């Protein structure tokens, strides 16, 4: 049972072939979840399941540069379920992040922050019980 | 130079005579700051300087329980200055939090979440460069 928000420092920084695995359960009354790949106060990749953005479920992805969010990438395929276990995997490729939820490909996010090595940590926040957060190279 | 949003776990939980000190600089075009004393999925005490709430500066304080905000406490005495250093100290008393900014008493916030020792962490977010965040007992 990890404390949320949970900070996953990436000691040597993001590199292609890094594979991150997050296991947890969605809280019963969840509203929001966020994963934030950070380069300083910039957010290279924000992955944000919203359970009730006006009584809809959506995944919103974006980048925050100088405290300004950029173009939103939205999608409606929403694999999370209130009260239920989930698995998120993020695979870093040269040109994008790949995200798979519950072993199924969910989305790709093209890198906007190009200095991959400078992304130093993953923040995991929001309405989950967090079971595990880890990283390796594959 | 901490990463914002920054989460300061409070090992052992909030108790009276806990003193929290936050140091940083307000960004030059700041819009908002928030300190959130968190209890589980709730916010026992949200302290929220708004630099541009319809072209007025105001401090809003409130509590979030089961995702509902409560009664707002608003005040106009506004000690932050865009692009300038600040110091916030919060002293926990049995009946309220005391907040001082730049060594001067600013406000009190009477406890609404009475289970003080379940308040486990302080989140610090918004348009700041965060230099330090710490706690001790006095
Ligand atoms: C709708 C929207 N959302 C975004 C923006 O978009 C994203 C990327 O494109 C990104 O996902 C954002 N983001 C996600 C997270 C996040 C953080 C987190 F911890 C978890 Cl766990 C998580 F899963 C996700 N962080 N950033 C998304 O930004 C969200 C956003 O800006 N806000 C959330 C919705 N709003 C409120 O709830 C405001 O309500 C206030 C309330 N308060 C203040 C804050 C706050 C948060 C914060 F981080 C900082 Cl730095 C602050 F300084 C403050 N959070 N909640 C309180 O202050 C109460 C006090 O009484 O008042 C609420 C209020 N305000 C008004 C006008 N009314 N009320 C209110 C009061 C009461 Cl009593 C009752 C009811 C109400 Cl409604 C605002 C904050 N964007 C977006 C996208 C883009 Cl591309 C560009 C710009 C924006 Cl804004 N739009
Ligand atoms: Cl949000
Ligand atoms: Cl806001």
Question: Can you lay out the helices and strands and say which pair or pack?
Answer:
The structure is a homodimer of 138-residue chains.
Chain A: E1 6-9, E2 18-26, E3 33-39, E4 42-50, E5 58-65, E6 68-69, E7 73-75, E8 85-92, E9 96-101, E10 104-110, E11 121-126, E12 128-137
Antiparallel strand pairs in A: 1-11, 2-8, 2-12, 3-4, 3-11, 4-5, 5-6, 5-7, 8-9, 9-10
A molecule of 3 linked components (SXP-PZE-SXP) sits between chains A (32-34, 46, 48, 60, 62, 69, 72, 125-126) and B (32-34, 46, 48, 60, 62, 69, 72, 125-126).
User: Per DSSP, what share of the residues of chain A sits in E-state strands of 2 or more residues?
Assistant: over 45%
Tally of separate helices of chain A: 0
Largest interface: A-B, 14 and 15 residues
Overall structural domain count of chain A = 1
The best one-word shape of chain A is globular
What do you see in this structure?
Two copies of one chain form a homodimer. In chain A, the strands form two sheets. In chain A, strands 1, 3, 4, 5, 6, 7 and 11 form a seven-stranded antiparallel beta sheet that branches. Chain A is mainly β and 138 residues long. Chain A is built from no helices and twelve strands. In chain A, strand 8 (85-92) and strand 9 form a beta hairpin. Chain A is 0% helix and 57% strand. Chain A has a single domain, classed as Jelly Rolls (Sandwich). The radius of gyration of chain A is 14 Å and the shape is globular. The A-B interface holds A 3, 5, 7, 27, 29, 31, 38, 40-41, 67, 120-121, 123, 127 and B 1, 3-5, 7, 9, 27, 41, 66-67, 120-121, 123, 127, 129. The structure holds a molecule of 3 linked components (SXP-PZE-SXP) and chloride ion (CL) (2 copies). A molecule of 3 linked components (SXP-PZE-SXP) sits between chains A (32-34, 46, 48, 60, 62, 69, 72, 125-126) and B (32-34, 46, 48, 60, 62, 69, 72, 125-126).
């Amino acid at each position: 049972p990890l404390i949320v928000p949970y900070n996953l420092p990436l000691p040597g920084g993001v590199v292609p072939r890094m594979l991150i695995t997050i296991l947890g359960t969605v809280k019963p009354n969840a509203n929001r979840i966020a994963l934030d790949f950070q380069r300083g106060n910039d957010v290279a990749f924000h992955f944000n399941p919203r359970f009730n953005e006006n009584n809809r479920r959506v995944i919103v992805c974006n980048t925050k540069l100088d405290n300004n969010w950029g173009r939103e990438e939205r999608q409606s395929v929403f694999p999370f379920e209130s009260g239920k276990p989930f698995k998120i995997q993020v695979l870093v490729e040269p040109d994008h992040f790949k995200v798979a939820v519950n072993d199924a490909h969910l989305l790709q996010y093209n890198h906007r922050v190009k200095k991959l090595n400078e992304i130093s940590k993953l923040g995991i926040s929001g309405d989950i019980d967090l079971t595990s957060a880890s990283y390796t190279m594959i």
